[PDB]
Write an enzyme that holds these catalytic residues in place. Structure first.
Site, short mmCIF file in Angstrom:
data_model
loop_
_atom_site.label_atom_id
_atom_site.label_comp_id
_atom_site.label_asym_id
_atom_site.label_seq_id
_atom_site.Cartn_x
_atom_site.Cartn_y
_atom_site.Cartn_z
N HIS A 23 0.81 -1.23 0.00
CA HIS A 23 0.00 0.00 0.00
C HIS A 23 0.84 1.28 0.00
CE1 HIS A 23 0.05 -0.19 4.57
NE2 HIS A 23 -0.02 -1.49 4.31
N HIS B 36 6.57 7.05 5.47
CA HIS B 36 6.07 6.65 4.18
C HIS B 36 5.37 7.83 3.53
CE1 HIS B 36 2.72 6.04 7.01
NE2 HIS B 36 1.99 6.51 6.01
N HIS C 188 2.05 9.11 0.66
CA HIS C 188 0.85 8.86 -0.13
C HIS C 188 0.96 9.79 -1.32
CE1 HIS C 188 -1.03 6.81 3.32
NE2 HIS C 188 -0.31 7.69 4.01
N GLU D 126 -3.38 13.37 1.59
CA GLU D 126 -4.50 12.85 2.38
C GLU D 126 -5.18 14.03 3.06
OE1 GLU D 126 -3.08 9.34 4.66
OE2 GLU D 126 -4.09 8.28 3.00
N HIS E 258 4.41 10.98 5.84
CA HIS E 258 4.04 10.72 7.24
C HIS E 258 5.24 10.12 7.96
CE1 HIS E 258 -0.46 10.34 5.99
NE2 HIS E 258 -0.07 11.59 6.13
N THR F 128 -4.67 6.45 8.83
CA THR F 128 -5.43 6.67 7.62
C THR F 128 -5.54 5.42 6.77
OG1 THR F 128 -3.54 7.33 6.29
CG2 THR F 128 -4.66 9.05 7.55
ZN LIG Z 1 0.28 7.54 5.94
#
Ligand SMILES: [Zn+2]
Length: 257
Positions: free
Chosen positions: A61, A91, A93, A103, A116, A195
């Site tokens: 992910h 990591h 997104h 996000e 994050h 999240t």
């Molecule tokens: Zn995250």
């Protein structure tokens, strides 16, 4: 299993993870005009000088750059936090296009990506215990916009070919997360959640106001990663972001005027 596709994305998560419809979910839209300056917030303390990165992992992910969190080596404290939080991993997104990927949003604006840096409260002993507590985690969120390259990101970008598919990891020692920070540590803060499932409501979110700039070539390499395992059909790891969730009974605080 859960993911970011049409049939298993964020709108489906609640069926297996009911907390994903809870009272303190993340991310949220940050309405800059209704966030309130709180003069009682202390300055953030980011102490990453002794950080020890170990590994980078594609977990299907995102990719996590993992750190040795067995000693106080890289810690976040101050700001809204009580006590000391240890860095365990960071990591990102990101989107399929530069116009989306973050996000959190800022007055509904979506950034190209969001970083994050995940920390856990040392009073709980380890991450697994901490993540089940209402004040167990502190996540520093940093927005990425596309412009000039971020020099300190390049070592991450260059190892991604070695972890293209889910379950691949590579040695990633001596990486300095300070090279991913903007100049200013002005932030918004609010109580929220993971999240990703299980969406546990264990996170004090600290979102920096100042984005970092990364180059188009840098984010393009993020988009070459795969959600799938080797030998399974190729699905590009893009748009691995959860959208903004209802603020409900929360107030976002700002550390700055
Ligand atoms: Zn995250």
């Amino acid at each position: 299993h859960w993911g970011y596709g049409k049939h298993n994305g964020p709108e489906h998560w609640h069926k297996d993870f009911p907390i994903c419809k809870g009272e303190r979910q993340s991310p949220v839209d940050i309405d800059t005009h209704t966030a309130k300056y709180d003069p009682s917030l202390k300055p953030l303390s980011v102490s990453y000088d002794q950080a020890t990165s170990l590994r980078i992992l594609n977990n299907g992910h995102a990719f996590n750059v993992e750190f040795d969190d067995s000693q106080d080596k890289a810690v976040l404290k101050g700001g809204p936090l009580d006590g000391t939080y240890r860095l365990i991993q960071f990591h990102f997104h990101w989107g399929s296009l530069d116009g989306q990927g973050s996000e959190h949003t800022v007055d509904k604006k979506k950034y190209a990506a969001e970083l994050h840096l995940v920390h856990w409260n040392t009073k709980y002993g380890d991450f697994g215990k901490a993540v089940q507590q209402p004040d167990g985690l502190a996540v520093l969120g940093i927005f990425l916009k596309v412009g000039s390259a971020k020099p300190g990101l390049q070592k991450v970008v260059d190892v991604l070919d070695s972890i293209k598919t889910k379950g691949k990891s590579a040695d990633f020692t001596n990486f300095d997360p300070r090279g991913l920070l903007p100049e200013s540590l002005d932030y918004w803060t609010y109580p929220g959640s993971l999240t990703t499932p299980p969406c546990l409501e264990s996170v004090t979110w600290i979102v920096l106001k100042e984005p970092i700039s990364v180059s188009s070539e840098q984010v393009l390499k993020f988009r070459k990663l795969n959600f799938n395992g080797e030998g399974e059909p190729e699905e590009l790891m893009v748009d691995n972001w959860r959208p903004a969730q209802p603020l409900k009974n929360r107030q976002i605080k700002a550390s700055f005027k």
